[PDB]
């Protein structure tokens, strides 16, 4: 029909206008700015601790708010909260659905969220008068497998699912208070901003979207990759974020300027980034490649500065403490490893 | 207990108790069989899971002091290249195809029949990088209607290059060999084949024999005897 053809033409010419607008402001490259500063020295880390006890692959970990505790999720149906200083198992929680792909720790420290491949997200209470850990709220309504979930407040959580739609909920009631739609491919990860007012989510369609929490509509769209995007996190400044994709490439995107800041890739690496995280100062990017060992990238020069080669299988999760003294790398060999 | 306080020792005791509980819980689930159930459309997955009944649907049953656990994942409707590595360690892969569904066509395209789709799915499952040495248990379901559909209507619509006697046995053999030719390894993988029976006992016994063979092969490879 004529209406469909004219609508497609209008969409194409808006796409052209947006491309021209994003190309107009791309005047200088990031290489010319950071190539004059002193590169960081080689990062030699050693496995201070070793958290054995899991008997299956490890799919997610999240550092606590006091930078002493962490929680890990395994495929044997186990959620384990450790003590990183003395390798003490503070809590062990059995799950109902053994096919969990994500976990999260509340900023206050009272609740833990877990879910995956079951369309349901469960909240567990840690500070209970009975001394045990029990489920307090189950959120259902997604039609795809859950990919990531992050705590916004003590009564607010945001979850991304495989049904191309994200959802911000209300733990008190249990019904969705905001629904974020507009993604074509499967959404694989989200990350809450430091100010807790916006968030970015990457999808299998090689695109990421930055949303607005208060209103609930897609605000910005970022593209430039070539395959699925498996990891997303903000820069600690809060006005940038790094994605990692399956085509052996990480990219850094700014929120004010919708271009590509830098790309992180190497010819000898043909494997896909499974996790992305930053340091306290934003000078150390720790992307965990699935070539049986992790990696450390200088987040400001795109070159390597160290290798955390201590794992015998795919590394899946990677976290950094709030004060930045420790780094943990979970992998499918069922062994966690805190570095320093 | 040289430098630890009166409370750190109790924390160590609690950690040891948690470790013991994990060890006793991580060995009671290492004697169970993980069968990943697949299929396509109306192959008969519901009928088959009813035949051995007790996001992802988990079924647990028992047969001759052996606990089987099956994962029906037909209700996922998600990109299979993002969640298929979770089933890397499955013992076998049950596969279901109806052989009396060769003349019908899919609603997407008139030319596209409902039999080439099953062959494409089998090719995509029998050549997966995560299932190089994982056995498969092929099923042919609803054979009662196949004879009636073949006695009046020859199967030259689905296989124009097939020169047979338009009988049940020759057509079934041709379908079986065409399905088994999709295998590309022939050494590490061992495709089984079966025709569904009215009684559940035959199918349950066939699955039991197949998983027993897979278990014994894995044990022979484990102890370095082969």
């Amino acid at each position: 029909g004529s209406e469909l053809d004219q609508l497609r033409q209008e969409a194409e010419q808006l796409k052209n206008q947006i491309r021209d607008a994003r190309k107009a402001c791309a005047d200088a490259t990031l290489s010319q700015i950071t190539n004059n500063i002193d590169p960081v020295g080689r990062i030699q880390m050693r496995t201070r601790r070793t958290l054995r006890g899991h008997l299956a692959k490890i799919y997610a970990m999240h550092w606590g708010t006091d930078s002493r505790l962490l929680v890990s999720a395994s495929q044997d149906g186990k959620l384990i909260i450790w003590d990183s200083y003395t390798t003490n198992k503070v809590h062990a929680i059995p799950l109902r659905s053994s096919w969990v792909m994500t976990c999260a720790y509340a900023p206050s420290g009272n609740y833990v969220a877990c879910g995956g491949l079951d369309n349901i997200c469960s909240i567990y209470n840690l500070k209970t008068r009975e001394g045990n850990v029990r489920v307090s709220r189950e959120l259902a309504g997604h039609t795809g497998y859950l990919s990531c979930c992050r705590f916004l407040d003590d009564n607010q959580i945001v979850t991304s699912s495989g049904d191309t739609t994200c959802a911000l909920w209300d733990i008190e009631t249990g019904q969705q208070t905001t629904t974020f739609t507009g993604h074509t491919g499967d959404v694989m990860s989200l990350s809450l901003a430091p100010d807790t007012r916006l968030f970015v989510s990457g999808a299998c369609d090689a695109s990421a979207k930055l949303w607005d929490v208060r209103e609930g509509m897609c605000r910005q769209t970022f593209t430039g990759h070539e395959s699925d995007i498996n990891a997303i996190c903000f820069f600690p400044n809060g006005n940038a974020f790094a994605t990692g994709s399956d085509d052996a490439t990480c990219r850094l995107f700014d929120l004010r300027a919708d271009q590509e800041l830098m790309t992180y890739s190497h010819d000898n690496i043909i494997c896909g980034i499974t996790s992305v995280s930053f340091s306290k100062s934003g000078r150390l990017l720790l992307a965990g490649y699935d070539d049986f060992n992790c990696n450390v990238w200088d987040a400001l020069k795109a070159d390597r500065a160290g290798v955390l080669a201590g794992h015998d299988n795919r590394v899946s999760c990677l976290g950094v403490t709030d004060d930045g003294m420790a780094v943990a790398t979970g992998s499918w060999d069922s062994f966690l490893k805190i570095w320093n | 207990g040289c430098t630890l306080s009166a409370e750190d020792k109790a924390a160590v005791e609690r950690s040891k108790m948690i470790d013991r509980n994990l060890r006793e819980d991580g060995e009671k689930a290492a004697r169970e069989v993980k069968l990943l159930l697949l299929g396509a459309g109306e192959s008969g997955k519901s009928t088959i899971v009813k035949q051995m009944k007790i996001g992802i649907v988990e079924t647990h049953f028992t047969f001759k002091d052996l606990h089987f656990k099956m994962f029906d994942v037909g209700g996922q409707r998600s990109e299979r290249k993002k969640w298929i590595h979770c089933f890397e360690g499955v013992t076998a892969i049950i596969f279901c195809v109806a052989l009396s569904d060769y003349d019908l066509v899919l609603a997407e395209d008139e030319e596209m029949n409902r039999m080439h789709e099953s062959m494409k799915l089998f090719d995509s499952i029998c050549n997966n990088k995560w299932f190089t040495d994982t056995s498969i248990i092929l099923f042919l379901n609803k054979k009662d209607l196949f004879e009636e559909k073949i006695k009046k209507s020859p199967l030259t619509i689905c296989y124009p290059e097939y020169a047979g006697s338009n009988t049940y046995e020759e057509a079934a053999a041709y379908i079986q060999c065409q399905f088994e030719d999709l295998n590309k390894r022939k050494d590490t993988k061992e495709i089984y084949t079966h025709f569904t029976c009215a009684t559940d006992t035959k199918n349950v016994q066939f699955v039991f024999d197949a998983v027993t063979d897979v278990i014994i092969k894995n044990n022979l490879k484990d102890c370095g005897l082969f």
Partner: single-chain antibody
Amino acid sequence: VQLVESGGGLVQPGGSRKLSCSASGFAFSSFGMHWVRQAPEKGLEWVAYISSGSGTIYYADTVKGRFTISRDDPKNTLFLQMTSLRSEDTAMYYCVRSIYYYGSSPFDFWGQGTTLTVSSSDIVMTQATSSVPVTPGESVSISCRSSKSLLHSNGNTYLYWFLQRPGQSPQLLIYRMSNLASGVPDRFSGSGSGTAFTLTISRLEAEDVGVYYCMQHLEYPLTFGAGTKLEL
């Protein structure tokens, strides 16, 4: 959450008795168990301790080798048996609950207590003050004295400020010398470095009148101090 204790009474100088406490409303199978003895019109003192899963068992040196503590996990019950009762063994007993992990609040529930009457090296804990008259609306400060350094190598400071009221069982106010318990107002406070410690109340009310105690947990035994009384 509740603990019910029974087994006390009037006994002859020769006879063996057992005190049994039953726990309901929580997971007894993961809580360390204590006993506390309090002489009538006097202070209180520790008795024994059993850890989770019947791992280790301790005793007080006063009657060491004569008490027998046993824990029944399926029924959530604890027993303490005593055989050759002397004259000093007339007192009333609490059975506190405790759990030990990083961030927990040990000595949180003190049960109720049951009385038993008999018919006829260690850090010392002492409080010089014994009574202070006070009118509601003004701050009160009490001091507690030790004979060593309570700060362990890890960084903790084991002193538990707790409160007893007439006819009402003791309750936890301050654990590890700095943090407040749950279910109490923000009126109470406590902080002390080294050897001298202090407990402080901002605005008195009619409920705060009673005896206040400090207790130390650096090592064993668990020596209690002399309580300080606040009357209206």
